[PDB]
Design a protein around this ligand. Structure first.
Ligand SMILES: [Ca+2]
Ligand SMILES: [Ca+2]
Ligand SMILES: [Ca+2]
Ligand SMILES: [Ca+2]
Ligand SMILES: [Zn+2]
Ligand SMILES: [Zn+2]
Ligand SMILES: [Zn+2]
Ligand SMILES: [Zn+2]
Lengths: 478, 478
DNA sequence: GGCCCTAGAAAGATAGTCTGCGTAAAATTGACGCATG
DNA sequence: CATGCGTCAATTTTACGCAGACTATCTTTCTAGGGTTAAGACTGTGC
DNA sequence: GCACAGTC
DNA sequence: GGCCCTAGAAAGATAGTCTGCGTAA
DNA sequence: TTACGCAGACTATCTTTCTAGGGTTAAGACTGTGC
DNA sequence: GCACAGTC
């Protein structure tokens, strides 16, 4: 059935359309509506001004563009009051002011507060639920997974208050929001996923290991693909349940040594030499264990990947070798995210989810992009370049309108005019001059607060001056 | 004797000098001459050019300036081939090119290769050692310690080859060079420290826990201070043997539950109600244990002469309260370092040590600086501004000389000219005479038929002129 | 609502700076005729 | 042609009122992040 | 029949 | 060198561009 | 009063190693209790 | 008188 982006999004060769595939217009439109609803409350009558207006689609895309660049650079835990510090960079200030950015980041909302009282008792995830579901839906519809899938967990660090955040001791960040997800091995496309949501998890009888494998697998349950799992999800009853009609999937993964189903023959005695392995069968399933170290034993379960052999080049059972090759399907995605991620400090947990969705979209967008382009036969650029182009495609239309203000400073105006593509169908000069070519109004060496107009410029440095200081040439020129 | 900078570094209000106190000429001179020795071995006749040149002190300081800014901007990754990408920023570009930076950093050496081969069987740390000892020496000499000191260890991440590389679980970074360290409490000034250097460390009878506390505390050995330390070091024989003619220091810290030092009355945790505590006296010193949780007990040792009882505001024994306040003296230093660290990927372990020394010099310089400024009675700026000022003080002389080349591009010339604080005219205080009095009264460039009043005096020749002929400057002046 | 601890960033507000435009007083400054040589 | 005096309404240069948009910097609240006596949630076995 | 200690 | 895996930066080298001074048309 | 060589510094981009970083069967090195 | 398994 092949692997790759589906027919619907196949002939796309640029980073913005590949991004819109995951976000869509419905998500951006919902963000704009609810954000405005919130902004309208946080506007006491002292706040009338440019920085405290409302939002639209162009601004939200530009905002995302800033988050995309934030991920490219490592400035994601850097103060916003430094990011927008001119002289270090004109990259962020050219899109919007630091105050507009701060106001908006505090006001983005993904839901309708008026209906919370009928949702919150049943769904602790309410404030991000509509967006999450639309997002995951897009992910599934844009791509056809290959032969092997990997299921594992991802933690979005977040130490603020959150009803379902949980501690995990062995992670880089230990106290955030747990998300379970499925990715295809070898490509790292995120296919599916869902929040853990604490102690809700209303499974019925089914333990969580099995429950989540069966739910995450839903899109692909009608055909045969493999599943690589952790020991949190791998078990004997799951290996057998997945082979019943409603699922055609099979499973490979390690198991815990304390499970009841493992025979004593595969347990670690001290008479068993180091480096040996043994196989036994539980019917259709093959259970294998081996001891790489004098006091350590590892167990693996493999269902449809049947038969048994040892790879003489390493001495390892072939089943573990297979496992080692597919087990990285989900953590590789996380590794790509930690290298290029935009996740900022915040005291509102639904933002943790929004930042996570932006990072996932950037990876999935890249995968589709890369695939479509290499299929066409053109060279594919790295993620770093994809992201730089994504930045411009998301912010250019906003910067273009920002320029309409007759009073948009000068240095902002000059930088925007030389950042934009200038993809104008037929633009040309009339007399070698730029289409704006305006002189500054005020005197270079005078305080701006006095608004003293400059009627002349310095021949030797082309600066605007007032007669009180100079007329033909400036005092700084000589 | 109080706490604070010593007599020699008592009145420094300039950040650059505060930095130089921990490097001095001996470290810079050794680095630059050994680096030149290395550069000459990396040349090929085909490489003759401006990039592959010998270093000098100004470049080395500028180079450290880049590393200081690197820490401010968190550019500890970020390929240098991106950091020096004009249009994102000119902050590094204006100091040196990316290829000069890559060549220079690659060639830095802190030692003499012709001597090393006869030193290496005795000291595995040879390639760093000379600089290291100079560095620590200055760290000890400046800044008198306070009444509370803390001893713990820090790990310099490094996964490359290193003979004494250590793996430590439960860390931010699993592998690296372990540094034993002593820091002042309250003010996190790094006083002393030393590499672990492998299992070959030779001690005589004394365990390492005990050994390191005695060596780290040497410079304060004859004064009474209260050392707070981890359970890797805390023990009865350490506590008993630090209150003798030599060594007059006390120890406070947690202990392991398996030491046969702890009586069975404390080593219980079964009949004891949760939240209660018990303690006893062994002699000069005391041991307390308490049971914060129904399945967990903690033991603490104090060799201070005290019975501090229980703090009623929490119910915790006062020894615990004390411990919690001073235990953070070393890890807080590591936290400050990781928030603004200058470190880069490298395959040469001595660089890991150099990067470590840069971060410590930056924090210790800040502490001396902060102290002197608040003592004077002036406001102290945060570390972020301190680092920005340090950057300019280290890179300015270099940039000033870089401008000497007639061919130093145009954008480099302009970005450098507008960042240098002293790029000013030799401006006078006043001007004795310009209009003079009434020399002509008519324009000397005007016909007798016009009799135009001369409304101006030539700026550079004081001639009687009409603005039409001589705008401000005369035609004979320019 | 959520283990001890810290440094420093977001949360949230207030006072100030950099750009454009328009009009009216102020600011000249460029001819205007009366002499000398 | 080179100078000289005292006159004016053209010219130009301020002064500042009509704002709009963006920015530096302050205090207070509270996450990000090191650290271990310290944090969840799960499965499967002893009393 | 409970609540008890071992791993993500 | 010294667990499994990957993605992407640093090693390390090559070919090319932006800048002024001396040549005159 | 505008073009061309010549030499000096800086710049983009390529391919081959091999560390930063994510895991979990996996990584040290010290201290005190098993035969 | 030797070899093993618990915490940074
Ligand atoms: Ca702000
Ligand atoms: Ca896992
Ligand atoms: Ca390079
Ligand atoms: Ca410690
Ligand atoms: Zn002026
Ligand atoms: Zn000028
Ligand atoms: Zn004239
Ligand atoms: Zn003149």
């Amino acid at each position: 059935s092949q692997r790759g982006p589906t027919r619907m999004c196949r002939n796309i060769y640029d980073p913005l359309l590949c991004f819109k595939l995951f976000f869509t217009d419905e998500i951006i439109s919902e963000i704009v509506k609810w954000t405005n609803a919130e902004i309208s409350l946080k506007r006491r009558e002292s706040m009338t001004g440019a920085t405290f207006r409302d939002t639209n689609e162009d601004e939200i895309y530009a905002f995302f563009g800033i988050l995309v660049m934030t991920a490219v650079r490592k400035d994601n835990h850097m103060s916003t009051d430094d990011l927008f510090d001119r002289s270090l960079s004109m990259v962020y200030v050219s899109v919007m002011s630091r105050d507009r950015f701060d106001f908006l980041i505090r006001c983005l909302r993904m839901d309708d507060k008026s209906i919370r009282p009928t949702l919150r008792e049943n769904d602790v995830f309410t404030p991000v639920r509509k967006i999450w579901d639309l997002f995951i839906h897009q992910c599934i519809q844009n791509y056809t997974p290959g032969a092997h899938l990997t299921i594992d967990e991802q933690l979005l660090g977040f130490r603020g208050r959150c009803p379902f955040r949980m501690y995990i001791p062995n992670k880089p960040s230990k106290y955030g929001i747990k998300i379970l997800m499925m990715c295809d091995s070898g490509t790292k496309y995120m296919i599916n996923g869902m929040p853990y949501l604490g102690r809700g998890t209303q499974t019925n009888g089914v333990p969580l290991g099995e429950y989540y494998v069966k739910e995450l697998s839903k899109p692909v349950r009608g055909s045969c693909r493999n599943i690589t799992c952790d020991n949190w999800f791998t078990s004997i009853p799951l290996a057998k349940n997945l082979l019943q009609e409603p699922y055609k999937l099979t499973i490979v993964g390690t198991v815990r040594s304390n499970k009841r189903e493992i025979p004593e023959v595969l347990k670690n005695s001290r008479s068993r030499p180091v480096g040996t392995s043994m196989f036994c069968f539980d019917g259709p399933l093959t259970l294998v264990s081996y001891k790489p170290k004098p006091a350590k034993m590892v167990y693996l379960l493999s269902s449809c990947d049947e038969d048994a052999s040892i790879n003489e080049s390493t001495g390892k059972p072939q089943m573990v070798m297979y496992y080692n090759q597919t087990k990285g399907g989900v953590d590789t995605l996380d590794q790509m995210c930690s290298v290029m991620t935009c996740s900022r400090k915040t005291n509102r947990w639904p933002m943790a989810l929004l930042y996570g969705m932006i990072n996932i979209a950037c990876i999935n967008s890249f995968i589709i992009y890369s695939h479509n382009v290499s299929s066409k036969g053109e060279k594919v650029q790295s993620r770093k370049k994809f992201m730089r182009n994504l930045y411009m495609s998301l912010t250019s239309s906003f910067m273009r309108k920002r320029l309409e203000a007759p009073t948009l400073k000068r240095y902002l105006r000059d930088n925007i005019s030389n950042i934009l593509p200038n993809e104008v169908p037929g633009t040309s000069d009339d007399s070698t001059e730029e289409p704006v070519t305006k002189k500054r109004t005020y005197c270079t060496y005078c305080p701006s607060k006095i608004r003293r107009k400059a009627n002349a410029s310095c021949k030797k440095c082309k600066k605007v001056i007032c007669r009180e200081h100079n007329i033909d040439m400036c005092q700084s020129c000589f």
